[PDB]
């Protein structure tokens, strides 16, 4: 790109502005080969959008249910009270995993076949009239862009997407490390910092791993660890 990640540095010869959010940042040179660069661009796009949805979900769940730790949201009793069927309607998490596994296997194999060969799985397999335009890799469109917001400046809104996604990824890492260090949600952490800035910051919580070593979820024991050896 033109504006680079640091003053005085030079961009690599393979990074000069095809992609959005190009700051010429590849210190390890992982995108030196174009096939690897395409694969890592797909990975960055899906990581950015998943972190985007995750930050939105973590922030919204603390508004609606502030009393539920998002780190403990996988616990069966932290689930919303809904009927899953059977004698009692309780969750089982096996069928819950099975639903997501089947649906995501289908959709991610579709995306993978798109990544391997461009414009190879654009057509709907059942109703062959339906079609996806797919102007660029990672940007399918069609029913994925119903409001047609990409008809204008595609590069500008792509830059907005990738920059917000990078911010969301950094924010999700912050969410996880803060939840592991404090045992509280992100907005609770923000309120604690706003209450006592010099008495409650990273220097008072980084040595502690507030997450328990293991948890028991309906008959099985999932081992747990922090991202650093806290106690």
């Amino acid at each position: 790109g033109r504006r680079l990640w640091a003053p005085g540095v030079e961009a690599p010869s393979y990074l000069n502005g095809e992609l959005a959010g190009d700051y010429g940042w590849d210190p390890l040179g992982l995108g030196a080969k174009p096939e690897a660069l395409k694969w890592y661009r797909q990975a960055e796009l899906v990581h950015a959008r998943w972190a985007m949805l995750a930050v939105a979900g973590i922030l919204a769940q603390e508004i609606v249910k502030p009393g539920v730790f998002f780190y403990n949201a996988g616990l069966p009793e932290n689930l919303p009270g809904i009927n899953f069927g059977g004698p009692e309607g309780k969750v089982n998490l096996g069928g819950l995993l099975a639903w997501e596994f089947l649906l995501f296997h289908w959709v991610e194999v579709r995306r993978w076949q798109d990544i391997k060969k461009k414009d190879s799985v654009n057509q709907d397999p059942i109703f062959k009239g339906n079609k996806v335009p797919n102007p660029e890799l990672g940007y399918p469109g069609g029913i994925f862009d119903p409001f047609g917001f990409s008809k204008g400046n595609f590069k500008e809104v792509q830059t907005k997407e990738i920059k917000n996604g990078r911010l969301a990824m950094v924010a999700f890492v912050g969410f996880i490390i803060q939840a592991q260090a404090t045992g509280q949600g992100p907005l609770a952490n923000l309120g604690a910092h706003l209450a006592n800035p010099f008495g409650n910051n990273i220097t008072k919580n980084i040595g502690t791993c507030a997450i328990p070593s293991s948890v028991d979820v309906q008959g099985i024991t999932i081992p747990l660890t922090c991202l650093w050896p806290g106690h």
Binding site: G85, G86, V91, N92, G95, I220, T221, P223
Partner: protein
Amino acid sequence: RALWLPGGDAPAHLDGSLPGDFGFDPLGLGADPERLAWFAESERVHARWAMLAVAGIAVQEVVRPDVFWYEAALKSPMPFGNSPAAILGLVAFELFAMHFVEVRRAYDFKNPGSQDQDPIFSNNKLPKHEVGYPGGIFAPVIPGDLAELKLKEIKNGRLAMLAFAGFVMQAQVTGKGPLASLGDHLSNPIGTTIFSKAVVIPGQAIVPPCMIPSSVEYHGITIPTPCFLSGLWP
């Protein structure tokens, strides 16, 4: 052509001449052409046997809900003979009949058109056909064209092969018949799948026990009934 993975590439040894050719050969098992013909015959006979078996299991579970199809040999009728050793005569009769008919089919495969004549009545003769599709007296009526019916046959046969594998594995993990397992899945969809009662994580593994006994006493023979690779179950 229709590919098992749309957008992919079919291997060069699967042109599309065979019925049900969707380009599925990731291991390259059919890359040898004579091996491809032998495996086509094997797929046809496996498909037909699995079709008959799945239909029989479903019917004899509907007709007799009190008889487990896995255990159906222990409670099978004995219309021939007054001795418990009459099973060996039925085994001998079946072995003779299947040896005859399978030698006829095999020598049709190796020598096409050689086994087209009735060995008893020389006037009766099967018309000229393709290998693996006899026709003639075997197909008195053909409701439609041959190619689409062959595609339907191979699709239903593959579905029946998968269904028989499912019948076997569900019999091991539940000790009960197919439609009873279907009803139990319909009663509690979230807590009856294989993902429900089987979980393996790096910490521990939960493996469901198999309800079929390890052996049975059939007139003093002690027939072993091992659960199929139950140590490798999730």
